[PDB]
Design a protein around this motif. Structure first.
Motif, PDB file in Angstrom:
ATOM      1  N   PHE A   1       0.846  -1.186   0.000  1.00 45.80           N
ATOM      2  CA  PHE A   1       0.000   0.000   0.000  1.00 45.80           C
ATOM      3  C   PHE A   1       0.886   1.242   0.000  1.00 45.80           C
TER       4      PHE A   1
ATOM      5  N   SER B   1       2.093   1.588  -3.807  1.00 48.62           N
ATOM      6  CA  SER B   1       1.130   1.671  -4.912  1.00 48.62           C
ATOM      7  C   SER B   1      -0.214   2.314  -4.566  1.00 48.62           C
ATOM      8  N   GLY B   2      -0.641   2.200  -3.307  1.00 45.55           N
ATOM      9  CA  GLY B   2      -1.853   2.888  -2.835  1.00 45.55           C
ATOM     10  C   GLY B   2      -3.180   2.249  -3.247  1.00 45.55           C
ATOM     11  N   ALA B   3      -4.237   3.064  -3.280  1.00 42.07           N
ATOM     12  CA  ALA B   3      -5.588   2.589  -3.579  1.00 42.07           C
ATOM     13  C   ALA B   3      -5.716   1.932  -4.941  1.00 42.07           C
TER      14      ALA B   3
ATOM     15  N   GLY C   1      -3.314  -0.138  -6.131  1.00 37.20           N
ATOM     16  CA  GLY C   1      -2.312  -1.207  -6.138  1.00 37.20           C
ATOM     17  C   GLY C   1      -2.860  -2.518  -5.596  1.00 37.20           C
TER      18      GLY C   1
END
Ligand SMILES: [Ca+2]
Lengths: 549, 235
Positions: free
Chosen positions: B224, B227-229, B231
């Motif tokens: 997370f 790459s975040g939301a 990923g």
């Protein structure tokens, strides 16, 4: 589970309306959506639908419709307790079921608890049990709503099905006469005054929902004056509050502008130009527009030999579209790699610094970094970037800056520091001459596992595509009253890899296992047939059953 | 004939019937996607480990099936026909079991059974509702707790509003502002001392990873962060 749409009413050329839908649930093998036509018993539809739902999430019946993810707050958490299985609501009131899980090569048990607010997600013993969906008890009705709207032949008959749809879903409307509409559908809770929807509430009695907000409050528009309706999971409407998801925000930085700017560059659109937007948005870098003003003026005073300016001049000479080279492994322009570097460094200095570790990992992402098989779904502006953007705006942002992200220093100083980081890390990787930089292009995959992470095919069946494209899992287009031709409505779509997932025991793949897979990659499309002539004229097979009962 | 019901085009079926239409639908689906559809049924109901062994993910069982049972039971006869017919359609294509037509994947993975209206419904409810219309991280209280332990009660809550703003009037909206949305307790909450978002991980091929609880948390965190939301650990 995200995805985009642009319905075009005054804005259509050589037609009365054009609906282009591009839902984004990720890319799978076999295809996520399923093509189907239904004829009789009231229905007269053609289209394609996720997991072969009885209802066609994307189609037409001779009106057309589509959906994107709504993302409204229709779910809240009630903080309920060392009288086990009881909670206080001035009295000690739980519902439980016992579940055993069978295991193939192993051993079989647990309990799930429900309160009057709903299922218990978690029990924190040191303090509390947390348990509420505005749509609870209306799930099946939401299914039959999606089914019945297929039979609708005008705006009223449609909207009264929209109001039975309880999940947070954008629905869209177009019809033969060039009428278009939009309904941010869903059940939503009528909250107490003072109820902050971003955080749990006590479940002791005083904070219970009053009931459900009226369908009159669900955002709606019919024949808007802009002559269109565009969405990419953005705010339906002014003052409309988003889902409570920490990573989700509706700010001034939004990717739907990339759609909007295209739909305003010219007065009208043919069905070809409307489809051509999938291409445009697909390869569009989503952050260049947001941060390029700031980079431009942070380096305005630097000399040209300064790498930090060099980088920014490179971005300044870029049209903001990524095209992959013939080798199939690199982009023509290093823009995204540059912005990824800079943005990553910037977030590490601002938003992340201001947040106590380990929660700074929530805001570190630059929204670019991905693994070898390529992105799992769409690409978006990241939550970090969006917050940063509000801070870069300063007093032009309506958001109160409780903590200064720039640590008392001017923007231009932090910006320049991140460019220096970006240059250090990028000059090491691709070398000191920017004009030779061959930065990795993003690939795409049709994963053999469904979104849950559970296999729906053999590991081998995974399909590759050199160019990642920021577009719908499928794309469909309906065009109403085309000036040329004998047909009132023309429909197209593309269900890649193909319609079938069948492999015979001997391992022989069906004819239609893979025949849309090159079509998808090239922005091509096949026709959808509705009328009995069109269907019969293009029949490849025909079977008749007798069903008793 | 009243009892008569299929034509195909790129393989896309069109169904013709004059009433329980969805049997045709159920049929063609079981021909085209029988394996994919069986593994959606197992996924939406948390029975995946019955055949796949790492998936004990199964503990999905985030809903109350008796609610959905009861909803189905109170349907009109006509509404019920959709679900009943789709299921019977699927079941008829009995032919796979009579001449194992059996998709290769069943052989590879080593196990199809008949369907019910519940299963069919569950395919929708498991995906559109229990997955996609169920987005909350109210993880938010853990962020708030930590924000207050660093800035103090007042300034913590001000920083929480800077990171997860309640509304933002500068946001682009599909409905132009020229209608608007007419509808215009955090200090009553205990502390939250690991965020649930860490107990959700999938590898690059999209498969579930079968890590340890510790490891899983470390992984979810790590990806997370990168790459975040959008990923592998995004939403
Ligand atoms: Ca909420």
């Amino acid at each position: 589970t995200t995805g985009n749409m642009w319905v075009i009413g005054n804005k259509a050329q050589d037609a009365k309306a054009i609906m282009v839908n591009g839902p984004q649930f990720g890319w799978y093998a076999p295809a996520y959506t399923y093509g189907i036509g239904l004829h009789g018993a009231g229905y007269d539809v053609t289209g394609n639908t996720p997991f072969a739902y009885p209802g066609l999430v994307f189609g037409h019946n001779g009106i057309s419709w589509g959906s994107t993810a709504g993302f409204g707050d229709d779910v809240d958490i009630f903080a309920e307790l060392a009288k086990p299985g009881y909670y206080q609501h001035g009295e000690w009131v739980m519902l439980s079921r016992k579940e055993t899980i069978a295991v193939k090569d192993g051993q079989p048990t647990f309990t799930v608890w429900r309160t009057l607010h709903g299922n218990v997600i978690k029990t924190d013993t040191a303090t509390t049990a947390y348990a509420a969906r505005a749509w609870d008890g209306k799930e099946v009705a939401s299914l039959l709503a999606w089914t019945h709207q297929m039979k609708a032949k005008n705006w009223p008959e449609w909207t009264q099905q929209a109001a039975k749809q309880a999940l947070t879903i954008n629905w869209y409307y177009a019809d033969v006469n060039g009428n278009i509409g939009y309904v941010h559908t869903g059940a939503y809770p009528d909250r107490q005054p003072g109820h902050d929807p971003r955080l749990p509430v006590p479940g002791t009695g005083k904070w219970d929902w009053k009931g459900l907000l009226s369908f009159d409050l669900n955002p709606k528009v019919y024949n808007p004056q802009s002559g269109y309706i565009a969405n990419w999971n953005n705010s339906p409407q002014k003052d409309y509050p988003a889902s409570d998801l920490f990573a989700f925000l509706w700010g001034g930085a939004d990717r739907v502008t990339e759609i909007d700017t295209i739909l305003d560059k010219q007065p009208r659109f043919t069905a070809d130009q409307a489809w051509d937007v999938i291409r445009q948005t697909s390869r569009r870098d989503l952050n260049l527009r947001l941060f390029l003003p700031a980079l431009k003026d942070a380096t305005a005073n630097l000399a040209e030999n300064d790498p930090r300016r060099q980088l920014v001049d490179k971005l300044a000479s870029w049209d903001g579209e990524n095209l992959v080279n013939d080798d199939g492994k690199t982009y023509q322009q290093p823009g995204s790699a540059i912005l990824n570097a800079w943005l990553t460094s910037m977030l590490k200095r601002t938003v992340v610094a201001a947040v106590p570790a380990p929660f700074g990992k929530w805001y570190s992402a630059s929204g670019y970094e991905t693994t070898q098989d390529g992105p799992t779904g769409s690409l978006n502006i990241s939550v970090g970037a969006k917050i940063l953007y509000e801070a870069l705006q300063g007093d032009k942002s309506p958001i109160p800056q409780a903590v200064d992200l720039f640590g008392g220093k001017p923007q231009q100083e932090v910006i320049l520091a991140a460019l220096d980081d970006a240059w250090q890390t990028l000059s090491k990787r691709y070398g000191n001459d920017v004009t030779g930089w061959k930065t990795p292009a993003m690939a795409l995959t049709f994963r053999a596992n469904n979104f849950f992470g559970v296999p729906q095919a053999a590991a081998k069946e995974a399909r590759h595509q050199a160019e990642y494209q920021n577009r719908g899992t499928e794309n469909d287009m309906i065009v109403f009253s085309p000036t040329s031709g004998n047909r009132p409505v023309l429909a197209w779509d593309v269900v890649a890899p193909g319609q079938s997932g069948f492999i015979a025991p001997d391992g022989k793949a069906d004819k239609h296992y893979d025949d849309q897979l090159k079509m998808y990659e090239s922005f091509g499309r096949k026709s959808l047939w509705l009328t009995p002539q069109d269907v019969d004229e293009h029949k490849e097979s025909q079977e008749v059953l007798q069903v008793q009962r | 004939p009243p009892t008569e019901v299929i034509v195909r085009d790129y393989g896309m079926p069109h169904i013709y019937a004059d009433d329980y239409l969805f049997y045709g639908y159920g049929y063609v689906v079981a021909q085209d996607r029988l394996f994919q559809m069986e593994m959606a049924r197992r996924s939406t109901q948390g029975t995946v480990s019955e055949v796949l062994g790492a998936f004990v993910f199964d503990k999905i069982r985030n809903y109350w099936p008796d609610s959905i049972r009861a909803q189905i039971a109170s349907l009109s006869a006509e509404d019920k026909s959709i679900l009943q017919g789709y299921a019977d359609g699927m079941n008829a294509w009995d032919k796979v079991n009579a001449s194992p037509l059996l998709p290769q994947q069943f052989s590879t993975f080593g196990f199809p059974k008949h369907w019910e209206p519940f299963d069919v419904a569950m395919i929708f409810v498991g995906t559109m509702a229990n997955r996609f219309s169920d987005s909350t991280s109210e993880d938010n209280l853990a962020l708030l707790t930590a924000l207050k332990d660093k800035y103090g009660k007042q300034q913590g809550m001000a920083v929480f509003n800077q990171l997860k703003w309640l509304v933002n009037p500068s946001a682009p909206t599909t409905i132009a502002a020229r209608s608007a949305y007419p509808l215009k307790t955090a200090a009553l909450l205990p502390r939250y001392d690991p965020a649930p978002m860490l107990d959700r991980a999938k590898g690059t091929d999209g498969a579930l990873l079968a890590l340890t609880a510790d490891q899983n948390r470390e992984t979810i965190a790590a990806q997370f962060a990168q790459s975040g939301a959008n990923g592998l650990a995004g939403y």
